[PDB]
Symmetry: C2
Subunit: 203 residues, 2 copies
């Protein structure tokens, strides 16, 4: 009866399976402390390291679930108001995906689980030892101080995480992130646009 | 590296392309009111409006620029338009590209870059489907269109084709709208080669 069809290229249509938020639960592991204690000290360390080992390379993972067919991104919350993606700083000679895998495990990994990381979703660059970041390398900037790379991390149907005691794991709908740098910063707030190309299935 | 981890794209100078001039193209709707009425009437007929849009990119001194169509001082748009019922999205975009930028006298489209959704017969659009919206009235799909090394475009008299740098678009929703101004973000995953 039926004819056999191709296969669409995954560049044209990238399909991702999403599962209920209630399929994902977490436990508690030992606290993970911030290396820097202030915004002034954060850019001092960044400056000190740049003179020695060059541009900082950070990688971040975007984990997506659904609740009633609405995509939600998983975020780490430190002390109510500071939201972040799981991820961090690569070591100087470290591969990007392997690095993110190590950092994903450090921050979310159970203690008794392999990460599927096959999609780059965007890049952000920091021209100066200062807050501003851009989804491009700004004109005339030859040595940016940080390169931040974002990846989509696909979840299995069910996952159990272990989260450092000082953090909470939350789930934010794309409509709460959209146009909301005050609440989530310029990177997390633009995930709705960065994620708009994926064809999500709601399982 | 897999194409899902690294898309490498070839960019060429803006001096590798010329503009031509053909006959004026006029919009199917004569006003803003009339534009949202036709959408209403057609949704009754054939359902959700399907539109497709192309992002054509060049470089100027190692800097990426998006090609936009300008309708006099303030109004900017991407090349694209409405698909016919049951039309292939990529073939439809190719038809619409030629209708706009092709002359009287060969588009490479391999990447989807974004999706936008219109919940009501009104201006606001979103890069996701809003809560409780089961019937969006328009679905807009965006593709990176890959340019040949050199090309000749034909631009209708009432339009100007302009090359907009990404820094001009970024965080400039009032100048360019929520879609055009978010193209820097949508293009950030690509690895551009400046030939």
């Amino acid at each position: 009866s039926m004819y056999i069809q191709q296969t669409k290229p995954l560049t044209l249509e990238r399909t991702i399976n999403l599962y209920p938020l209630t399929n994902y639960t977490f436990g508690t592991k030992e606290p993970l402390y911030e290396k820097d204690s202030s915004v002034a000290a954060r850019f001092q360390r960044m400056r000190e390291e740049f003179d020695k080992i060059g541009m900082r390379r950070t990688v971040e993972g975007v984990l997506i679930v659904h609740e009633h067919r609405l995509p939600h991104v998983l975020l780490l919350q430190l002390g109510t108001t500071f939201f972040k993606l799981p991820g961090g700083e690569l070591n100087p000679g470290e591969d990007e995906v392997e690095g993110l895998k190590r950092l994903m495990t450090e921050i979310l990994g159970r203690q008794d689980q392999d990460w599927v990381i096959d999609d780059c979703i965007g890049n952000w660059w920091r021209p100066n030892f200062e807050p501003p970041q851009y989804p491009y390398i700004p004109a005339h900037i030859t040595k940016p101080k940080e390169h931040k790379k974002l990846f989509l991390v696909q979840l299995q149907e069910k996952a159990l995480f272990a989260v450092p005691k000082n953090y909470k794991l939350v789930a934010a709908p794309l409509f709460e992130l959209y146009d909301n740098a005050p609440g989530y910063g310029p990177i997390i707030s633009s995930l709705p646009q960065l994620l708009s190309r994926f064809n999500f299935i709601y399982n």
